[PDB]
């Protein structure tokens, strides 16, 4: 559901400063209306330009090619009930937006932090040798094999319409 957007903005031009500077950002958001709001949240803190005093020049939407599985490293900050913290996370996904979906669900589940509690500092691709987290690194290898981690899930699902049967089914492994 996440999407990559590039936003340009600038302070409204005046007599003291004709041709103000242009600032660009990369944003991940579910749509164009949330993305432009998040651009004004940062430009107000980092550059002290409220939304009343500036204008947005573009909301570029960028669609990425998948088809191969890469590593990503996300540097972010979030807020808990006792303060603010920094954190680095690693994930394997096919596009950057999909890697941000995975991050937001792990923050929501293990830290209970929602979307507006989180500021993304950095998102970059990480080559296989340079990985630093054990979970990701296991799969950055040649020849990884494991048996199915939950084959019971197949059997139960079929038993939701086939409510009564004549023998208890097996779980092939």
CB of 147 to RNA, least distance (A): 8
Q: Which does 88 bind (CB under 5 to 8 A by kind): RNA, other proteins, none?
A: RNA
Identify the H or E element spanning 118: strand 118-125
- 43-74 residues labelled b (16+ CB within 10 A) or e (exposed): beeeeebeeeebeeeebeeeeeeeeeebbbbb
The contact pattern for other proteins, residues 82-101, with x = CB under 8 A and - = no contact, is ----------xxx---x---
3-state secondary structure at position 151: coil
Q: Which does 119 bind (CB under 5 to 8 A by kind): other proteins, RNA, none?
A: none
CB of 90 to RNA, least distance (A): 7
Q: For residues 65, 66, 71 and 77, what is the CA-based torsion angle, rounded to 10 degrees?
A: 70
18, 83, 109, 149: which one contacts other proteins (CB under 8 A)? 149
- 133-148 residues labelled b (16+ CB within 10 A) or e (exposed): eeebeeebeeeeeeee
133 binds RNA (CB under 7 A): yes
Whole-number Å distance between alpha carbons of 54 and 48 = 10
Cβ nearer to other proteins, comparing 43 with 99: 99
Q: Which residues bind RNA (CB under 7 A)?
A: 85-90, 102, 105-106, 108-111, 133, 135, 153-154, 157-158, 160, 162, 164-173
Q: Which residues bind other proteins (CB under 8 A)?
A: 66-69, 92-94, 98, 134-135, 138-139, 142-157, 159-161, 163-169, 171-173
């Amino acid at each position: 559901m996440m999407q990559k957007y590039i936003v340009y903005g600038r302070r409204l031009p005046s007599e003291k400063f004709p041709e103000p500077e242009v600032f660009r950002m990369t944003i991940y958001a579910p749509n164009e209306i949330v993305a432009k709001s998040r651009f004004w949240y940062h430009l107000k803190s980092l550059k002290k330009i409220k939304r009343t005093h500036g204008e947005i020049l573009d909301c570029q939407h960028i669609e990425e090619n998948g088809d191969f599985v890469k590593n990503f490293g996300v540097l972010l900050r979030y807020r808990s009930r006792v303060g603010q913290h920094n954190m680095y996370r690693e994930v394997r996904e096919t596009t950057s937006a999909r890697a941000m979906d995975k991050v937001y669900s792990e923050m929501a589940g293990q830290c209970r932090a929602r979307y507006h509690d989180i500021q993304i500092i950095n998102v970059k691709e990480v080559a296989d040798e340079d990985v630093r987290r054990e979970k990701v690194a296991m799969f950055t290898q040649k020849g990884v094999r494991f048996p199915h981690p939950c084959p019971y899930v197949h059997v139960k699902r079929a038993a939701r319409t086939a409510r009564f049967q004549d023998r208890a089914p097996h779980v092939p492994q």
